[PDB]
Design a protein around this ligand. Structure first.
Ligand SMILES: CC(C)CCC[C@@H](C)[C@H]1CC[C@H]2[C@@H]3CC=C4C[C@@H](OC(=O)CCC(=O)O)CC[C@]4(C)[C@H]3CC[C@]12C
Ligand SMILES: CC(C)CCC[C@@H](C)[C@H]1CC[C@H]2[C@@H]3CC=C4C[C@@H](OC(=O)CCC(=O)O)CC[C@]4(C)[C@H]3CC[C@]12C
Ligand SMILES: CC(C)CCC[C@@H](C)[C@H]1CC[C@H]2[C@@H]3CC=C4C[C@@H](OC(=O)CCC(=O)O)CC[C@]4(C)[C@H]3CC[C@]12C
Lengths: 90, 90
């Protein structure tokens, strides 16, 4: 079950300004002490990290900003009128 | 080819809240153990870092917020009508 935890753990905190910079692309397959060998296709992980961070943090958050902004006025008027209606129930 | 990787590595993650604070301006050219000597013009790197972070994070992201916001209504109406058209194809 730790695999399912590792699916959601670091990509979720990646949205809130913690990119885990020590684990983006650690040096491996060299001697600095002998490092463990390079996993195959481990260079893909920073690239899809870049695409994910771009899509999430720039596209979806700003789109939710636009959604919150362009539906603010109708929701504000409806909420004011509904609160004035629910004053009687209170 | 590691030079081309180093071009894109840290400035890209600099947008998402990871400024790499240990490598902004490390102490050098002193004894704390003898540090390696100061590179010439290494003080320029935090200044252009400051200008880059300002321009990127404050100018361009907020401008994309404005672009997403002011074209939201036309895109929303067009997308609703296009989805209602593509219901038949589905
Ligand atoms: C659909 C949207 C609106 C809500 C989000 C729901 C899911 C994305 C959440 C809710 C329940 C969550 C699960 C609740 C419990 C666990 C057990 C957890 O197990 C461990 O951590 C085992 C311990 C370990 O070995 O570390 C792994 C994550 C997981 C599957 C969670 C994965 C994410 C889930 C499916
Ligand atoms: C302006 C923005 C919207 C896009 C520009 C950013 C990307 C084009 C950059 C940022 C991070 C970069 C990646 C950072 C690290 C790597 C790992 C690198 O692989 C290795 O170095 C091998 C393994 C190792 O030596 O540790 C291959 C390039 C790649 C995928 C880079 C490809 C280009 C990326 C995706
Ligand atoms: C134009 C916009 C819309 C898209 C962005 C495209 C480029 C900015 C990307 C796409 C392909 C990328 C290249 C794909 C592969 C590599 C090899 C990579 O090589 C290594 O990492 C060598 C291993 C090492 O020594 O660390 C260095 C980055 C580089 C040149 C990447 C640099 C960034 C590039 C040019």
């Amino acid at each position: 079950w730790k695999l399912a935890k590792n699916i959601f753990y670091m990509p979720y905190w990646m949205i809130y300004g913690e990119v885990f910079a020590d684990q983006i692309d650690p040096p491996c397959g060299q001697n600095e002490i002998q490092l463990p060998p390079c996993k195959t296709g481990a260079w893909i992980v920073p690239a899809i990290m870049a695409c994910y961070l771009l899509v999430a943090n720039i596209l979806l958050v700003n789109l939710l900003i636009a959604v919150f902004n362009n539906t603010f006025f109708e929701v504000k008027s409806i909420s004011n009128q509904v609160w004035k209606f629910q004053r009687y129930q209170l």
